[PDB]
Amino acid sequence: WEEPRLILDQPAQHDNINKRYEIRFGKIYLSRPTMTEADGTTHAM
């Protein structure tokens, strides 16, 4: 949450349309450690 907003702008002219594209960061989710095998299965480590 220190820098929660990435912003991209594009004043498209190709009828002027000023477009802002932005992504927000939300919650953090953690899990217990897991092990992923070569055959694709997973299990608790």
Partner: protein, 51 residues
């Protein structure tokens, strides 16, 4: 100190900083990298089709 206002303020400020839990637990059922590789495969397929 014995005033009720001071005791309530002390209780509120002491218990206010005790509650601190931002991260929420979750259960992983599959490989976390499965989405990345499947979307990379789809993107490579549509790149070949577009080419």
């Amino acid at each position: 100190f014995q005033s009720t206002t001071h005791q309530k303020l002390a209780k509120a400020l002491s218990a206010k900083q005790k509650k601190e839990s931002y991260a929420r637990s979750v259960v992983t059922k599959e490989d976390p990298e499965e989405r990345q590789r499947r979307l990379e495969s789809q993107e490579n397929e549509r790149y070949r089709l577009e080419r």
